Amino acid sequence: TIKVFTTVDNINLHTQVVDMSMTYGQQFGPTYLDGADVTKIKPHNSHEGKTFYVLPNDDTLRVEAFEYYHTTDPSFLGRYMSALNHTKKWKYPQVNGLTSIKWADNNCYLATALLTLQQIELKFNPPALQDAYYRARAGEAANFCALILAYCNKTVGELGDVRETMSYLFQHANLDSCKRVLNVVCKTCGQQQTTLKGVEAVMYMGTLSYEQFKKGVQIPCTCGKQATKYLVQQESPFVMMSAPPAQYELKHGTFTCASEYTGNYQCGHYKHITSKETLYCIDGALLTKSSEYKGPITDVFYKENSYTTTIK
Ligand SMILES: Cc1c(N)cccc1C(=O)N[C@H](C)c1cccc2ccccc12
Ligand SMILES: [Cl-]
Ligand SMILES: [Cl-]
Ligand SMILES: [Cl-]
Ligand SMILES: [Cl-]
Ligand SMILES: [Zn+2]
Ligand SMILES: [Zn+2]
Ligand SMILES: [Zn+2]
Ligand SMILES: [Zn+2]
């Protein structure tokens, strides 16, 4: 009868004395080792004193699991562990000082997201995500990638979108201070100012150009006509500007990083462009550099702190 530890968070460990003549499943319910489902398996001898993840089956474990993951979804742990079983076999090469991912299991959108997350200021609310984000920044990204899959409700090999992935992660981040003030000018209706907070204050869909957003973009007015929307005030450490992919020129020093998407809707591949002392293009493990870039861009990230318009 070996001594093991059970946990939902790998911080609070609970000593258990297990029966060597019963499965982990019979004694604990769903039980995992480093991602590997061992519910239907007897305790070996080299399992002695090791840490097992369990599905929460008492109040203490349910509270610990919510405090760590910020979800009570009973499927979360099994989806996280199933993802981790693959993400632990991925390769996380250091490319131009950034942790990337070698191509596997349609993971280009995760590699692009992971590269982006290393270049923008973001604090995650769930300790599971914040802890794994620090570990990923230091080169140990397998756990973080499995969490991103579980929080986005995506499995390994499923096709993914960087913008949708960033949106889910931002909904799990402290963006409460982020504020965006917009003005809409219609010939007829006149001027209406609106204030957005959190995720809606940092994401925009319809133009890649932060400068064009400051000048004004044409949107339909509920009245019928076309109106100009422009940015009045921005308080955030970054903005994400997205549009359906189109040929776009990226200028060294005018943006932080960008998502390149080649191919048809739900049938293409991401590469990541980052502005350093020159432009670096990261394609999983592969790196190329050039002074200029023109290609199909769908996301551009920019630095911000505080912007106020000069438009009266
Ligand atoms: C949306 C999506 C999902 N859900 C999953 C995987 C890929 C994409 C996608 O095509 N995204 C790209 C960036 C994209 C997003 C939006 C519009 C697009 C139009 C033409 C071609 C690609 C477009
Ligand atoms: Cl625990
Ligand atoms: Cl929450
Ligand atoms: Cl891929
Ligand atoms: Cl959260
Ligand atoms: Zn939360
Ligand atoms: Zn795999
Ligand atoms: Zn109008
Ligand atoms: Zn791909």
Is there a single domain that holds both residue 73 and residue 23?
A: no
**Which domain does 298 fall in, by range?**
179-312
Is there a single domain that holds both residue 223 and residue 303?
A: yes
The answer to whether residues 303 and 238 touch, using CB atoms and an 8 Å cutoff, is yes
In one letter, which amino acid is 29? G
Q: How far apart are CA 272 and CA 221, in angstroms?
A: 35
Count of CB atoms within 10 A of residue 164's CB? 13
Q: How far apart are CA 306 and CA 111, in angstroms?
A: 29
Q: How far apart are CA 44 and CA 42, in angstroms?
A: 6
Last residue of a domain, one of 144, 178, 212: 178
Q: Kindly give the number of the ligand 1 atom that is closest to the alpha carbon of 244.
A: 17
Q: Which ligand is nearest to the CA of 190?
A: 8
The answer to whether residues 7 and 13 touch, using CB atoms and an 8 Å cutoff, is yes
Q: How far apart are CA 145 and CA 278, in angstroms?
A: 28
Bridge partners of 119, per DSSP, are none
Q: How far is CA 94 from the centre of its chain?
A: 19
What does the DSSP 8-state code read for residue 178? -
- Residues in the chain, total: 312
To the question of whether residue 145 is assigned a binding role by annotation, the answer is no
Is there a single domain that holds both residue 196 and residue 299?
A: yes
Q: Residue 36 corresponds to which tokens in the numbers above? A: 């590997």
- Give the three-class secondary structure for 86: helix
Last residue of a domain, one of 178, 193, 217: 178
Q: Report the first-to-last Cα separation within the chain, whole angstroms.
A: 77
Is there a single domain that holds both residue 33 and residue 69?
A: no
- Give the three-class secondary structure for 189: coil
Is there a single domain that holds both residue 133 and residue 219?
A: no
Stated as kind and residue range, the H or E segment containing 60 is: helix 59-69
| Residue 87 CB-density burial (10 A; 0-12 exposed, 13-18 middle, 19+ buried) | buried
Q: Kindly give the number of the ligand 1 atom that is closest to the alpha carbon of 263.
A: 21
Residue 57 — left, alpha, or beta (φ > 0 → left; ψ -120 to 50 → alpha)? alpha
Of 165, 174, 175, 224, the C-alpha closest to 201 is 175
Catalytic annotation present for 47: no
Centre of ligand 7 to C-alpha 200, Å, is 34
Centre of ligand 1 to C-alpha 228, Å, is 26
Ligand 4 is an ion; its neighbours by CB within 5 Å are 103, 106, 108
Catalytic annotation present for 269: yes
User: Can you give the resolution of this entry in Å?
Assistant: 1.9
To the question of whether residue 257 is assigned a binding role by annotation, the answer is no
Is there a single domain that holds both residue 283 and residue 306?
A: yes
Provide the domain count of the chain: 3
Is there a single domain that holds both residue 203 and residue 154?
A: no
What does the DSSP 8-state code read for residue 161? -
Could you identify the residue written with the tokens 């990337």? 100
Beta strands (DSSP E) in 90-157 are: 94-95, 98-99
Is there a single domain that holds both residue 245 and residue 208?
A: yes
Centre of ligand 9 to C-alpha 51, Å, is 35
Q: How far apart are CA 220 and CA 208, in angstroms?
A: 19
Per DSSP bridges, beta strands 203-205 and 238-251 are parallel
Residue ranges lining ligand 1, Cβ < 6 Å:
159-161, 164, 244-245, 261, 264-266, 298
The answer to whether residues 289 and 281 touch, using CB atoms and an 8 Å cutoff, is yes
Atom 5 in ligand 1: residue holding the nearest Cα:
160
- Give the three-class secondary structure for 255: coil
In one letter, which amino acid is 255? F
Is there a single domain that holds both residue 9 and residue 98?
A: no
Query: What distances in angstroms separate CA 133 from CA 3, 77, 147, 148, 301, one per listed residue?
Result: 31, 18, 10, 10, 19
Is there a single domain that holds both residue 151 and residue 184?
A: no
Last residue of a domain, one of 151, 178, 205: 178
Q: Kindly give the number of the ligand 1 atom that is closest to the alpha carbon of 159.
A: 6
Give counts: helices (H), strands (E), the chain. Answer: 9, 19
Atom 11 in ligand 1: residue holding the nearest Cα:
161
Catalytic residue (choose from 47, 86, 108, 272): 108
DSSP output for 194-230: EEEETHHHHEEES-S-HHHHHH-EEEE-TTSSEEEEE
The answer to whether residues 131 and 82 touch, using CB atoms and an 8 Å cutoff, is no
Is there a single domain that holds both residue 61 and residue 44?
A: no
What does the DSSP 8-state code read for residue 107? T
Is there a single domain that holds both residue 107 and residue 142?
A: yes
Of 77, 71, 76, the C-alpha closest to 54 is 77
